[PDB]
Write a protein that binds this ligand. Structure first.
Ligand code: MN
Length: 826
């Protein structure tokens, strides 16, 4: 009789860290009709059908994959299959890749893209269901699939209670109340971030471990921070499981390094710049037991060259691959504000002196002490520089001032709230022309140290003071980069959208299909970060200036986060680095014409925009179709009201009642997840792998004349600098982490790629996606030409001779300084 021939592709667990065992009655599939229903309107369900044998005749599966034959009975009463149930009767879970129902014609083949772990059947409340690869808005769902579609969303939402288990697939929200460890020590207590006006914050994925005993508002510790199962990516190669390196670094490598310092087996401090360069030349010699602890660990072992006995050697950072000293030029200091690790904070300055919005009743007179007449603007007057839009600034004054007092009370942290003035030279490069180093002076609670202005100098002790002023600025910048440009604006801001998408858009939904590639690995890296990166006494607190105030500073900045200002053109306009100009291809004119991040970013932005504008009309012809999609409406309402709920009343949220709003929302989400993250992430070790170039912390203020510290500035400027910036032990730990986080796994999926070519059956969507990938390849060719253009050398390469490749769409594996993943995946 008639049978439907199927092929099941799966991966046994050991591949992602005997095939005959899958045969017999080990694995049952049941087809589900999309066209014929039972008396309650639900698609008819076929009989249990088991895997029949191993298929070895297929044209090479992917690594670790095995294919199995199956044949389903399916008479005329059953209609057309559109879904299936699967039950795993084996003890061990397996990774289900796909089901394919073969047909006479390729046209008739029915494909199911699953990519999901299937645990033993007794671990599931309801049987796992998978849908064919057709795409439907809710009003197009075949009637026999409507209830299944909704019941699956209900299953994914859960009920807001219970500890989440490894095999759960439940997506929900919670506040950042899991970072402190008060049951261990009150030193480890941290404010809850989110759920208040004092500390507003994006929500994260609910884990449900339950309260601590000492603080009912803080979540107890656990060995594993849950994510919904299919968010926890398995990898064929352990070296690609980069996210696990943070936990090893904090829990194993960091105590190993600490022991070498405690035992005085290695100098406690760097004593010259050459001691730092040594780290990637001959390496660092450490006790054998420290080497033996570190080098066998997955992911960690890839970070260092070693002899297995005595030496760890870091890779040579890109920033020093051509010149060891160019980082210390004023040219490079300014260039990195437009082409460095954090190229998105500089602003136009349209008046002089710069102003503060902070209350002098709190901090003392907040007037800027920089005088226009003190600046060398290459012969320009201040009025000319302002009128010609040549003045810019890197302004950390108002951001840092409210935290300076409490940071400076910590042992071995001292900072200023800095402001750097930049001039756009006639040659198109930026020139730093003044640094203001500000301290609060509450009249009644100051200390004795004063604010001051430092001007450029090339000789004498004043040149060292200027070099130190640059370090204070870059400590501010490094903190803002890692906590705000990077952690807050990418990792943290995106996770609410991931959760809302799974809770409210079916796998069938076109906008689920559009957005979910841009979420790959994001909940997973974030959960591992809550455990080991941003936790109390974790990697960032123990290596960056603000210590226990680090994450809360990001919540203070989130007060000002605006979703629609994350769009690249809006960001550039808001920061005064571009103006609206409809006579240009991108609709904005850059005020720094050779601004590599912005100029390349606008190309990528435009390509994403075209893709979203082509894809949306395939599913929504009119504004009313957007209004009428109940999944989409619930999705966006929840993303805002719950996911970003502390900002839910802000007037700038798109209402999502039009095609233009749907395009804008999707475009911004994709931009944040792909290009924005890439631009702020993949330069971490390339630029920051030399601690002097990107200091993470400062430990003392400027010395006063007539002290031994001032005499050291005169006699040993390198030691003065090294004593001011991050100490050697936290340097080793922070270099290690940024090396991990700058690495592309070999199984990454980049912008213009998907994890399966059959993600939809809709040929128009597949065609539009192909055009997007082709456009990205054309853009890459254009960006290569920019880097090869000698006219652009000053900003695109600088004296470090490092071509700006962070917005090249494609990359090979490794620490490449290029390539745009689809998602926030590391
Ligand atoms: Mn990242």
């Amino acid at each position: 009789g008639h049978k439907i021939k199927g092929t099941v592709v799966l991966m046994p667990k050991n591949e992602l860290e005997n095939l005959n065992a899958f045969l017999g009655r080990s694995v049952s599939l049941q087809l589900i009709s999309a066209t014929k229903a039972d008396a309650h309107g639900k698609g008819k369900v076929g009989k249990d059908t088991f895997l029949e044998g191993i298929n070895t005749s297929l044209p090479t599966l992917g690594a670790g994959e095995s294919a199995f034959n199956i044949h389903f009975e399916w008479d005329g009463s059953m209609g057309i299959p559109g879904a299936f149930y699967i039950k795993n009767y084996m003890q061990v879970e397996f990774f289900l890749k796909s089901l394919t129902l073969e047909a006479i014609s390729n046209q008739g083949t029915i494909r199911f893209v699953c990519n999901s772990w299937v645990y033993n059947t007794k671990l599931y409340k309801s049987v796992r269901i998978f849908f064919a690869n057709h795409t439907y808005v809710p009003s197009e769902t075949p009637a026999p699939l409507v209830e299944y579609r909704e019941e699956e969303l209900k299953s994914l939402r859960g009920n807001g209670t219970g500890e989440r288990k490894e095999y759960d697939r439940i997506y929900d929200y919670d506040v950042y109340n899991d970072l402190g460890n008060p049951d261990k020590s009150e030193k480890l207590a941290r404010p809850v971030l989110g759920g208040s006006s004092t500390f507003p914050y994006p929500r994260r994925g609910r884990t449900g471990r339950g309260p601590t005993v000492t603080d009912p508002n803080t979540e107890k510790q656990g060995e594993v921070f849950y994510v919904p199962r299919d968010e926890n990516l398995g990898h064929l190669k352990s070296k690609d499981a980069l996210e696990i390196g943070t936990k090893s670094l904090s829990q194993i490598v960091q105590p190993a390094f600490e022991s070498a310092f405690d035992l005085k087996s290695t100098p406690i401090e760097f004593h010259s710049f050459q001691d730092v360069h040594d780290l990637y030349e001959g390496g660092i010699k450490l006790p054998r037991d420290v080497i033996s602890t570190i080098i066998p660990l997955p992911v960690i072992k890839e970070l260092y060259r070693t002899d297995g006995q005595h030496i760890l050697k870091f890779p040579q950072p890109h920033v020093v691959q051509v010149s060891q000293s160019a980082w210390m030029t004023d040219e490079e200091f300014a260039r990195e504000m437009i082409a460095g690790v954090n190229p998105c904070v500089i602003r136009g300055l349209e008046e002089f002196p710069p102003k503060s919005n902070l209350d002098p009743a709190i901090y003392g007179d907040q007037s800027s002490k920089i005088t226009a007449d003190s600046l060398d603007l290459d012969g320009y007057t201040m009025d000319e520089a302002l009128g010609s839009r040549r003045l810019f600034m890197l302004d950390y004054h108002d951001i840092f001032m409210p935290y300076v007092r409490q940071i400076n009370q910590l042992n071995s942290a001292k900072t200023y709230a800095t402001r750097t003035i930049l001039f756009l030279r006639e040659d198109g490069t930026l020139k730093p022309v003044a640094i203001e180093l500000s301290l609060p002076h509450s009249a009644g609670d100051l200390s004795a140290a004063v604010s001051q202005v430092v001007l450029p100098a090339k000789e004498g002790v004043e040149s060292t003071i200027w070099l130190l002023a640059k370090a204070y600025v870059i400590v501010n910048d490094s903190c803002y980069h890692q906590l705000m440009s990077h952690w807050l604006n990418t990792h943290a801001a995106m996770e609410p959208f991931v959760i809302a998408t799974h809770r409210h858009l079916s796998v069938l939904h076109p906008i689920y299909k559009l957005l979910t590639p841009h979420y790959r690995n994001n909940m997973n890296i974030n959960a591992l970060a809550r455990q080991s990166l941003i936790n109390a006494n974790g990697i960032i607190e123990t290596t960056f200036l603000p210590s226990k105030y680090s994450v809360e500073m990001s919540s203070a900045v989130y007060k000002n986060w605006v979703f629609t200002d994350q769009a690249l053109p809006a960001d550039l306009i808001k920061r005064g680095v571009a103006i609206k100009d409809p006579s240009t291809p991108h609709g904005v004119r850059l005020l720094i014409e050779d601004y590599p991040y912005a100029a390349d970013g606008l190309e990528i932005w435009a390509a994403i925009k075209t893709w979203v504008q082509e894809y949306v009309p395939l599913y929504y012809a009119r504004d009313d179709d957007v209004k009428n999609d109940s999944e989409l409406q619930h999705w966006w309402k929840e993303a805002v009201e719950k996911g970003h709920g502390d900002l839910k009343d802000k007037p700038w949220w798109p209402k999502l009642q039009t095609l233009e709003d749907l395009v804008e929302v999707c475009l911004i989400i994709i931009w944040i997840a792909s290009a924005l993250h890439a631009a702020v992430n993949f330069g971490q070790y390339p630029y920051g792998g030399l601690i002097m170039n990107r200091p993470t912390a400062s430990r003392r203020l400027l010395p006063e004349k007539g002290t031994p510290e001032y005499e050291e500035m005169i006699n040993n400027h390198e030691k003065a600098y090294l004593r001011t910036i991050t100490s050697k032990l936290p340097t080793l730990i922070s270099l290690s982490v940024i090396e991990i986080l700058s690495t592309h796994a070999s199984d990454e999926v980049y912008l213009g790629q998907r994890d399966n070519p059959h993600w939809t059956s809709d040929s128009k969507a597949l065609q539009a996606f192909q055009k997007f990938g082709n456009k990205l390849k054309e853009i890459e060719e254009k960006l290569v030409r920019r880097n090869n253009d000698p006219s652009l050398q000053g900003n695109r390469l600088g004296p470090v001779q490092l071509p700006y490749t962070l917005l090249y769409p494609s990359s090979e594996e490794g620490l490449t300084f290029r390539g745009i993943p689809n998602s926030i995946s590391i």
